[model samples]
Target: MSKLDSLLKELPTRTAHLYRSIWHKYTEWLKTMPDDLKLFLSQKYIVKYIASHDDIAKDPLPTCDAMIWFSRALDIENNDVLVLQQRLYGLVKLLEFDYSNVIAILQKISINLWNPSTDSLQSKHFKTCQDKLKLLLDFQWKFNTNVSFEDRTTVSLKDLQCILDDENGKCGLAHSSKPNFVLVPNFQSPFTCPIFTMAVYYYLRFHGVKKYYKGDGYQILSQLEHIPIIRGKSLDQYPRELTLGNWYPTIFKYCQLPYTKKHWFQVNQEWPQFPDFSESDSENTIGIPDFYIEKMNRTKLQPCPQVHVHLFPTDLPPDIQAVFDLLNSVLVTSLPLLYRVFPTHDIFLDPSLKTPQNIAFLTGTLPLDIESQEHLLAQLIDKTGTVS
Candidate 1:
């Protein structure tokens, strides 16, 4: 029966649309109320109000959600306080991030407004928070998650020998009788990682990560199951050159990739060669995409701005751009971390610096300059050392 009691009674019931303006209307009424009435409306006080009212007590989450939204629009002091009552309690549970700390993290990163198109935000103290969460999720993915190949400690070629033996042996390769992807330990490098079993997701046609932004955290984690932990540092580095190869027939239809060959080379290279363009359409059409490799530069670490979407080469044929789009979303969080890893080579491509030297993708063949040719020859010689 005090001031808060009166304020609660005057609060509006729910509105279907224009939640912002609807809440604003209630603010107009609040303007006339006691100045001190708004002060008691912190996240803690709102819970007390809900508990006191039987009708509101039935569902504390929605009740808190409405109040917090209204409070933010109405009171400057109460900005983002919905975070206090953990209005997104359900979402946080799925995200695998602590509610208190996520609020702390959100304070630093920029928000994505339009798709025309993207951004991220960061602060030092908040970075520790991001790293802690990232590190925690890495362990969680290996230990807690169930699905497939997350921790394939003793995987073997015999397990895959069924493919050579075919339909009768073990060609079924059933992780779930669906394509299952896992990081390939043999192919992993300091700046790159190889993913396999992509056909499983492709067979079922799993959505790209961008499509999963609004998805629950559990699904978000599942979508990024094969990706590495994006360090707080990599966000600043340029998108590294991609290594293309992996021609699994069943799922080749989904990803759009250039069919040109000699464009691909081994994982260890100054710059990877493009895939061989000599093959007929049928051979390259149904193949796996080349995963990108982050550059290594231990010297100059330039701090780049955060971009939410991949800033693909401008108008470089929409079809080619489509390939970049597929993985951009899942790797969005990983981009910033790339800069953090190695600062040895300055292959960082800024969109503004449109020089051909900085541009890696080409519609045609690359001229094998002396440095590149030597780099390739050195690799060739190293492999044949014992053979001779």
Candidate 2:
């Protein structure tokens, strides 16, 4: 066993704190909701935030939610959009961002969302059920909250036709036959490449990437499909290394993102046989798994970080701060290469400066201004591109 091998084995203990804490918080919040239409959201999609945390994320947003809570805190009323706007305004005021600047923030966010929807295709990549659930709620929450039509993400180009036509279209809990959501003006699919992209990294780190600080976590056994009866599902020999590698830089390019070289390299130092940091990997062979097992996937000792259960949300700060946080569980080996793909450019780019930004529910202790966040991200992207 290598030095990193022991350290990579220790990361699970540190990684466990985040989700367990969120779950604990969610269990508490569930006690508070009054019966309402939005209540259906928690049931239908496993929104996770319900009992999870009242505050959030950069992917840090929500509706009738923070506003409703904020409104009541300020004593407001029935027009939920107004209620949300007021809270956002209040949050903006507190942040002291130039009120004029807020419009651009919303506009950039809207523009980031303009992409083609995969209405008909089944998503082998994301939780389609959750994606649809959030899709409807995201429109309702976002458009309704923004002050002007400029920021509104309205349904466009037969957007509703797809949701209305979805064969798998049904609420997670109620199984509502009606689509229930009024499509946004430019209905950008919530299944935008970002979610699963981040999921890929979150999965890697949770399997234990922070070996130096966290200590040894789970050793990478075969990432075979482990069902109840079988300890591990045996994969065919032909594509085991190739398939497992798929989850990293190449096929599963999303695995590398929100780059954290310290976390990534620490884990790399662990494997029995891996490319030295000095050598560059070919695109075809990059991100191959380091851990392997004969009992399951294949006989190769292909090592990749073990899989983790949590999903890391991308949060970039706008301004510079002394220290920033990237959910350790969300950092992976190949993030440098993935940053260039257009799907990841925005998230891999900047942070919400004055306004709140949450990455995996971590609100910055010292927030980065938007410009500063952009500079930091750009530096990281370029630096990694050159070095990795």
Candidate 3:
């Protein structure tokens, strides 16, 4: 029996069938299939094949896996197999990025404006919401805390009140750290601001003042009885604290932004729900099961590293010190690329530095969460005048 035939028998029946079908299809498509499997499965050929074929371009993971299985069967060197695997890995990563939902929501927000009722109570509440949201945005932007995905620093009502009262931005939070007291203004387009809607909803529900009556000191005679006159007045009140549940629904109502239970944004559609794969089953792999498992495992195994590491102590051990040294080198290399990609306040800066490579490098380096990353991608696509 042929090596390919023998190897096919080793896989589950359905997986073997799929591998045979994809391998034959790929080989048939080649104008001159090379006798050397290594040459046939090289990165150049793989790229050409993917670029030229529409069906495979749309769904390449199966083809990628088929090639990997073929390389394993042919006893290709582990390093060469890894090269093929890397090509597959790159395709998988590309497939993983589906930001359509984020783009859809962004588009929805852009066109919708904040148009509250003209009635006194609704208008009053809406105005208050706008003010509060603006304050939150200002604090977040100045502190660079908007990008924080988890464990956001809580701002008490008193803290906000302090900022509201102070002309110099000297709130308790700002006094410890600081920014000049410039309020972050509303966006040019009001409807596009999701925070405005949230603030309005929050104020309507949680503005904590209660009206009370105060009796007059003097007693007035009415017929045969003495009665005291009373007056109504407003009292100073604190707003209710905001919660994720409150914010999430508000976000969804106005922006249609989808999120996971952990409050992380979910930009892609739900993944296909397939039954778990078993070694004894004759079922075909569905939804690139092995790749998904590995990707998730890798994510769990290697949590994202800390954004910055202190490298100051001169007496660190060699291996530890080497890591710091490597990080320092990476940072040094990254700075020039960053400067080229991002525009500065200086008008005289060279525009020639804004190359595609510089922009790509900068995008690659940002350690943003998936939702934020997808948001940025949408912006980039828009800026390039492309309809993604």
Candidate 4:
């Protein structure tokens, strides 16, 4: 019938007796109150009721512990009384809404001040999360003062380290049971959310905040089940081990071609350099493709691409020209995409165009596991099968 009745039935005999030993008398005290107050009594009133029954109330530790345990037991069963017990726990623990505090909260008040998230996002704890998110986003020059906070377009990454940091930078109040929630992007966007990613990274480092993630919430948790835990002070800063330290450096060391406008070009260029393998003194470097194919329009297009490792374990040094030349070298249109499917050449320059207006990546290697490499190569071949 009633939640209390159900709880009394479901709990073990000893537990039920233990709870009723206090609750029974508390219920009786509630019955003796005025109609307005009967249905609702502040935690202090409950404490007073216990003391009136010759039970300790001033130091209400035992009573509070038992009531809290009873509440937890009810919650496990999905009982509605969980909220009531939560409210009671909050009021009593805070010692707010008591006689000395000049307050008298109703006993049946549905507020669950114990858990801020449960109380709704409007609560102080939730506001703390929002505040911290705003600070972090603003620090990254992401926030537009012209736009309302709710209407801001860019998504954010919460610094979980903020939860453990000093109060000024913390995401929630020190006593918050649940961490604060913020607006983050959908799964796909985070992979290329460079501005947001680096913004969060710099913010965390500046604050000495040691922990962060590219994502948060249930999706991340689900993905994590299969991925190994990244337990550390921060993400590992290990560079990959390839023949030339990595393919990035290899590309920088070997591949050099002319660029005129948006695309890279080759008009009978020399042989493509493999890691540390330069051209010899003879016309011997032939038969093997120079990472290019002759187009009908008198242009040579590269038929295949080399996939370079994009997710570097650590921040690589910037090129002297104040650019991430290595990163730019790989992510751009590699000759592989221009292989033949599209009626285009790796060289997008008009015959008369001679200015070095822009550039494109000619050759780069994909850094993946053996299986991944096979699959990626197969997919590339299949997709690039259409000839112009």
Candidate 5:
């Protein structure tokens, strides 16, 4: 039968999931495919979305919300899923497309946008997520010449605040029925994927990144399932989560020099400091690949990387480049294989790295959780299995 026939038959599945399909749409099929397959799927969905939802031709298609409901109806956690539903419901109002005004978006922030991470979502473009933002800011920032608009009164930060305030914190152009898709922030857990985990495998392979176990699609989804949904949390909270190790803050700190906007890292006397990030198109600093390998080698990271957290490049200086080479090789080999196991989809990094064996966390989630207060020996021994 035709795919449309299949979809019509599975219409009831819209508010549900059938086995492990991404959400009975182009996206689901894309999850099992390679980049070629994914591109095909994205284009296909884009077309299908335009065709099925008449409002899309009139307004910009509501991708984010459609993604939200498509993912939510699967019956996931309330904290995270419900937030998407609410936000998308609100954003769908701006469905008029004409994102030509999207450039003025910064002027729309207000009271509702006050919380950097109220909904606990990862990306801020949809609402106000905080880990970091990588936006184009084309209309806002000048290019080709240093002659920036001096009186740039059009898109003032305060104006943006007022707009967000007007909306009471909920805004974004919403779509009609949404596209046939869902993207679970896969990196949030060791499991759970936006697409089928298998698509992640293929995406990684196509992109040639690193992967674990040459893992399968479902393995990637393990993260989506395990990731917590809490307000005020960002990648920084990854260290506290109960899952695979993370290396976000410590790693992100190394790139501190790249931040041009000092306030990007500063908090306005707020209770939580979720960062607003945009890509730092810096040319000088080495990229993440170098950081990953350098950090891995300087410290003891194999099997139990927790040991390397405290060590530094000064600890073991000579073998650095060789280790970099070794790491590069491994990433090249393993990532493709791993992607083959998973597929393509959106993934948000948890950013937290946990270590049950590390002396740092030996006591617990807090500084006092450990008792370097003379009980360090006992605690270290019991927790790390260290005898000496």
Candidate 6:
């Protein structure tokens, strides 16, 4: 049977009649258009016909449905047509909001298009981490049979490396034969990707970073103290935070360390710091200038100053919330293989899956110390399409 015939056969008799009539109207209009245009159903032509035809414009849903059916009948992809139908459906439901607010919301969406770029180290790093995380996620899904949180055993670094070696044929074994950390997947935000979070966690922990108790939970002590000057003297105060300036150098050194050595030596020394100006004025020892110190302080403080509060919102507007929902929906739809790695029962039905906390938890952003979180969140937003 033809696609249209199968579609018409499946619909109720009255609805089928309406669809048939709408299709007839659309094709009759198509006949008048240029031959090139009539070859395929385009969103522009569909919209133009709907707008110009008086009867169709009065009730656009039927026409939209007909166009979707027509697109399918012609073996053309119907994403654009379906999007149009969804927008029209959304328009009717959105009448509860003010017209101006609706227009503003639409303008916001139009301007915020997802344009993935490939020009920065950050994007390269993110893609690398994402691929590695995918391998682990896939392995866990295939081999780790335990579903219960309490019953499951956390995959240690050594075991994880063994798994990786088995899958990728001893590529990871060439670097180090032992794993130094445990791979514990955070089930709280399965969709948000907890593997990347665990990687960051282990990396920081491997550097001997200490975790301090905050009001909510245990957080790493990643904040830096201000430059302290004491009466024509300067004291060096090391930053506790992992910053972009020293991130590459530190990670490179860490990767080079032997498998037996778990912790990086001189963690504090690895942190980037403002240059000291101890010798000046013809070899006479001089204190750091107030203006220079202040300038350095401003530069250090400027990056990601407000990301902790703004990016990880405690509450979100409905419109803003929908963006995350749509993002999750798209991810789930497009990557069915990844989605299937999620257990079939308990985790899927959990209400926490949709919480603002989980939704906001992008891979590198969550499970990080506050300062590191801000730095990564800012980088991911500015340098990559991970957040956008």
* CA deviation > 4 Å runs, candidate 4: 1-6, 36-54, 58-62, 65-388
Q: After superposing candidate 1 on the true structure, give the runs of residues whose Cα lies further than 4 Å from its correct spot.
A: 12-61, 66-78, 82-388
Query: Which candidate, 3 or 6, would have the higher TM-score against the true structure?
Result: 3
lDDT by candidate, in order shown = 0.26, 0.26, 0.36, 0.27, 0.25, 0.31
lDDT of 5 by residue, 13-41 (tens): 65334322423544554465344222232
Instruction: Judging by TM-score, tell me the better candidate of 1 and 3.
Output: 3
Residue pairs that clash (backbone atoms under 3 angstroms), model 6: none
Lowest summed lDDT across 10 adjacent residues in model 6 is found at 168-177
Among these predictions, the greatest TM-score belongs to: 3
Give the Cα error of residue 91 in candidate 5, in Å: 6.0
Ranking by lDDT: 3, 6, 4, 1, 2, 5
Off by over 4 Å in 6: 1-3, 36-38, 78-388
By TM-score rank, best first, the candidates go: 3, 6, 4, 1, 5, 2
- Residues 365-385 of candidate 1 have per-residue lDDT tens digits of 332222322322222211221
| Pairs of colliding residues, candidate 4 | 40-107, 41-107, 306-364, 306-365, 307-365, 307-366, 308-365
What is the C-alpha RMSD, rounded to one decimal, of candidate 6?
A: 26.9
Residue 340 error for model 3, in Å?
Answer: 23
lDDT of 4 by residue, 111-181 (tens): 11111122222223213222222222322221101122221221222212111112221111011112211
Against the true structure, candidate 6 reaches a TM-score of 0.23
lDDT tens digits by residue: candidate 3, 24-126: 7777778664444466776656655764578887787888888777877786888868866865665555446453443344434332222121121222322
Candidates in order: C-alpha RMSD to true structure: 23.6, 26.9, 21.8, 29.0, 24.8, 26.9
Model 6, C-alpha of 315: deviation from truth (Å): 49
Please identify model 5 stretches exceeding 4 Å from their true place: 1-22, 32-67, 86-388
Worst 10 residues of 3 by lDDT: 226-235
